[PDB]
């Protein structure tokens, strides 16, 4: 008898035995072919640098530059410079401009010539900013490249009742793309969580569901009636295991419920999962 | 008109502003020039215009022309081993038939009621266990312990590659040391009768076949095995009693007769090292275990590479068999547990117990009763006890401090001796 | 590559190098790194390092395989890479470097990538 134990894989088949056994005609599949004199040989980034190449090439790099600028202003393509002024160096400016004459008149240019060039400083800020994230959708777009390994974990809990749970586990999974599934027993009965990712996308998942959220905190919930207190203090989390696989067939994060503790198993048997649930 | 030109064109920053157009932007195709022209892919910090750059002043120093102009067998020999090969046959032969036999015996009685009430019994006597004592052995961690067939005496090997016998029920302290020759000690196993023997395997690729004396400390060399290049991983004697076969790094697992200490066998066909060898108690067959995670199973009566087992996407490093000998259990890097029954075939193949976080050293069944239970050891600092039917888990046991190098089980199975990167062996009640 | 030196063990593949010389880099910007053999061998006798990085390549190899059974005895994890010259460029150095050990400070910015590759050694030891 039995079932969660799964005792009901103990039990003794004599068909299949004898079948096989008759088949066999006495001693496995194995030595079949003996009722030979040969043996055989049998076939199959990034660098860094350091301080000082920093400096050697941001001065060759900026040196190349400016030099090229001075030789454009020596042939007449670009613009003669004018002086910087400030409010320190505005006195001693003796540049034709209104400087006694018209007092207030030079103070306009000088207040004026200084916020424009701040104003510059801000432009090349936001228009970055801004270019970035078009940049970024191009990031968007780029669809993803199999890792060729993919680590895993495995939770196990009480409860799961309480919504503000129930909702964050819906988004910092596709927050960071990991793949997996959540499932549990009807409602109040307990249940299981699967994540699998890039190591980095896992830690920080692993990181919320023990340290950050409370699961023995209690949560006053809606009904269709109204509101009621729920008390999950008994509830508890832990992690089972974290490992390694040679395929996610996971292909999204879907959470559900299962009434019983049968087709759970083949809601993960269709990912050839079953194993993952622990009685 | 021209000499204006020509200036700005003899200029650097102009020879160089010219040529950063005329290279492709995407960060792609950038980098697939880099790696083909030989020079770092990425550096440090970068944006791809950035990386671009690079590029141009890398074309330009070397003067470098443009992306368009850069762009089996059988082995014959080895008679006297062909006769071996007969003796294996007719043991082989005799004895699986034995098993079969008695398999089936077995399957008539049924009587469901007996069986279910001793799984229960079972389950509730391995939860229950704990530690005994601890004790100590050196100052490195223990590499690999060993009960005689008596249970009487366990072997341990540190790192140091060290041996000392204790004495199973209490340990204290032992009975004689000694500093064997090697440094790293791979595994430690007895001969299966007369408990007058062991053999270890270690880093010096020098297996060590010991007379182990009586009551005396004067534990003493037989013999020394040489072949090994690097460092070997395990050992262990045929079920037989004859033969020793020797499974090291070199991708080469090495049958060994034990009275004569000659190379029976020198077989290949892993790409990367090996990392366990298992014979199966029949002594019909080997599997090996791999660094490349292809588990692998032999014949050793034709020489003949059997069925290829893929499951593990890390080096799996113990290959435990299974009393019965239909079944096999693998564990490895991936902290995962394949247990593959070769019976099937077509399609019932592999179960995996999700077993341990951090990895899987060395996986045990329980000798006497045929196999039910598996015994297992992570680096989680835990050690697990399964069924053989449903391989549900069912109890862990946590008395180690570090991690966990090796454990053997007592052939009653009332002992569990499990031994620990932390210097001790801890006898499980 | 070239025949990868047999005694060169444990040794990471490319995907660990990758983690583990770029928080050796990340720790000399903090200087909590210390280069070289003897400045790491005075690590372990203090009793301050997290764990040692090695070359693997370095030329002849004797010269730094002391470092393991010093490191045994005080119980810190240890791992070659591949190549000295990428190791030099990650402390910070123009030229060839065949050891390094991080050291502790558990007040650190980069602690959690510490333990996180010293997790990952420590299986590599078996």
Same mark, same amino acid.
């Given at each position: ?29 194995w ?7 040969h043996?055989?040989? /049998? $076939?199959?980034? #990034? ?6 190449? !920093? =400096?050697? +090439?941001?001065?060759n790099?900026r040196?190349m ?7 454009k ?11 910087k002024?400030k ?12 400087n ?6 030079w /103070? $306009?240019?000088? #207040?004026?010539?200084v916020?424009?060039?701040? !104003? =510059?400083? +801000?432009e090349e ?19 993803v ?38 499932? !549990?027993?009807?409602?109040?009965g ?28 209690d ?7 109204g ?7 008994n ?17 999204g994060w ?8 049968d ?15 622990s009685? | ?5 020509d200036?700005?064109k003899?200029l ?18 950038v ?31 070397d ?13 014959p ?19 699986s ?35 005994a ?16 067939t ?27 040391k ?38 005396e ?6 013999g020394?095995?040489?072949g ?21 790094h ?6 060994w ?16 090292g ?14 090996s ?62 179960n ?26 992570g680096?989680?600092?835990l050690?697990n ?22 454990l ?5 199975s ?6 620990g990167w932390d210097?001790?062996?801890k006898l499980?009640? | 590559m070239?025949a ?16 583990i ?7 000399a910007?903090l ?7 003897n400045e ?15 070359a693997?390549d370095?030329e002849p ?6 470092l ?12 070659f890479?591949?190549?000295r010259?990428?190791?030099?460029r990650?402390?910070?150095v ?7 050990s991080i ?5 650190s ?7 996180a ?6 299986t590599?030891?078996?």
């Amino acid at each position: 008898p039995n079932l969660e134990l799964h005792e009901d894989k103990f039990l003794l088949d004599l068909s299949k035995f004898k079948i096989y056994y008759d088949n066999n005609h006495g001693y496995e599949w194995w030595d079949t072919a003996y009722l030979v004199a040969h043996p055989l040989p /049998e $076939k199959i980034i #990034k660098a860094y640098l350091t301080q000082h190449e !920093r =400096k050697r +090439l941001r001065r060759n790099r900026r040196k190349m530059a400016r030099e090229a600028r001075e030789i454009k202003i020596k042939l007449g393509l670009l613009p003669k410079p004018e002086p910087k002024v400030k409010l320190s160096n505005m006195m001693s400016v003796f540049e034709n401009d209104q400087n006694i004459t018209d007092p207030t008149a030079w /103070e $306009k240019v000088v #207040k004026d010539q200084v916020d424009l060039r701040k !104003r =510059k400083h +801000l432009e090349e800020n936001e228009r970055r900013h801004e270019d970035a994230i078009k940049r970024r959708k191009e990031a968007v777009n780029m669809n993803v490249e199999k890792p060729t390994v993919y680590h895993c974990k495995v939770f196990q809990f009480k409860n799961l009742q309480n919504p503000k749970i129930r909702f964050k586990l819906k988004m910092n999974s596709k927050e960071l793309s990991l793949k997996g599934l959540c499932l !549990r027993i009807r409602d109040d009965g307990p249940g299981i969580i699967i994540v699998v990712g890039n190591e980095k996308s896992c830690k920080f998942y692993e990181n919320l569901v023990m340290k950050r959220i409370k699961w023995n905190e209690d949560f006053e919930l809606h009904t269709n009636t109204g509101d009621i207190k729920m008390d999950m203090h008994n509830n508890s989390i832990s992690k089972t295991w974290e490992g390694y696989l040679q395929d996610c067939k996971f292909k999204g994060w879907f959470m559900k419920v299962c009434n019983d503790q049968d087709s759970l198993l083949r809601t993960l048997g269709q990912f050839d999962s079953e194993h993952f649930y622990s009685p | 008109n021209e000499s204006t030109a020509d200036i700005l064109k003899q200029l650097p920053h102009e020879r160089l502003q010219a040529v950063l157009e005329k290279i492709p932007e995407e960060d792609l195709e950038v980098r697939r020039l880099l790696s083909i022209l030989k020079k770092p892919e990425v550096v440090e910090n970068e944006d791809v215009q950035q990386r671009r750059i690079r590029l141009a002043e890398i074309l330009m120093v070397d003067e470098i022309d443009l992306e368009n102009i850069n762009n089996d067998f059988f082995t014959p020999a080895t008679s006297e081993l062909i006769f071996a090969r007969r003796f294996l046959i007719n043991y082989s032969l005799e004895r699986s038939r034995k098993r079969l036999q008695k398999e089936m015996e077995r399957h008539q009685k049924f009587n469901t009621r007996q069986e279910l009430l001793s799984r229960r019994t079972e389950l509730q006597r391995m939860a229950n266990l704990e530690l005994a004592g601890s004790q100590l052995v050196s100052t490195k961690p223990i590499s690999a312990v060993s009960l005689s067939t008596d249970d009487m005496v366990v072997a341990t090997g540190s790192w140091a590659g060290d041996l000392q016998v204790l004495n199973s029920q209490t340990l204290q302290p032992l009975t004689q040391k000694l500093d064997s020759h090697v440094g790293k000690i791979g595994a430690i196993d007895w001969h299966p009768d007369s408990n007058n023997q062991m053999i270890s395997c270690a880093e010096d690729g020098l297996i060590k076949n010991f007379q182990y004396s009586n009551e005396e400390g004067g534990l003493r060399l037989l013999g020394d095995l040489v072949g090994h290049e690097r460092r070997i991983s395990d050992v262990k004697y045929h079920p037989s009693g004859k033969f020793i076969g020797s499974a090291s790094h070199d991708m080469t697992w090495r049958l060994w007769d034990a009275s004569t200490h000659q190379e029976l066998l020198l077989q290949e066909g892993h790409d990367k090292g090996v990392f366990s060898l298992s014979f199966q108690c029949d002594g019909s067959l080997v599997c090996s275990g791999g660094m490349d995670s292809l588990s692998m199973l032999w014949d050793i009566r034709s020489g003949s590479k059997v069925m290829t087992l893929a499951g593990h996407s890390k080096p799996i490093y113990t290959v435990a068999w299974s009393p019965n000998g239909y079944q096999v259990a693998t564990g490895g890097g991936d902290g995962i547990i394949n247990v593959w029954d070769i019976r099937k075939r077509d399609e019932g193949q592999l179960n995996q117990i999700l077993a341990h976080r951090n990895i899987v050293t060395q996986v045990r069944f329980s000798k006497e009763d045929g196999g039910k239970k598996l015994v297992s050891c992570g680096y989680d600092n835990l050690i697990n006890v399964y069924s053989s039917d449903t391989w549900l888990k069912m109890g862990s046991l946590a008395g180690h401090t570090d991690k966990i190098i090796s454990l053997d089980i007592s052939n009653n199975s009332h002992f569990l001796v499990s031994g620990g990167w932390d210097r001790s062996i801890k006898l499980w009640n | 590559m070239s025949a990868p030196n047999p005694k060169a063990f444990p040794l990471a593949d490319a995907a660990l190098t990758q983690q583990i010389l770029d928080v050796v880099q990340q720790a000399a910007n903090l200087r909590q790194l210390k280069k070289g053999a003897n400045e790491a061998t005075k690590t372990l006798n203090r009793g301050i390092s997290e764990f040692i990085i090695m070359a693997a390549d370095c030329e002849p190899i004797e010269i730094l395989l002391h470092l393991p059974l010093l490191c045994e005895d005080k119980n810190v994890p240890y791992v070659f890479v591949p190549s000295r010259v990428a190791l030099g460029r990650a402390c910070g150095v123009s030229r060839p470097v065949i050891a390094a050990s991080i050291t502790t400070n558990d007040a650190s910015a980069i602690k959690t990538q510490i333990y996180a590759v010293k997790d990952k050694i420590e299986t590599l030891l078996i």
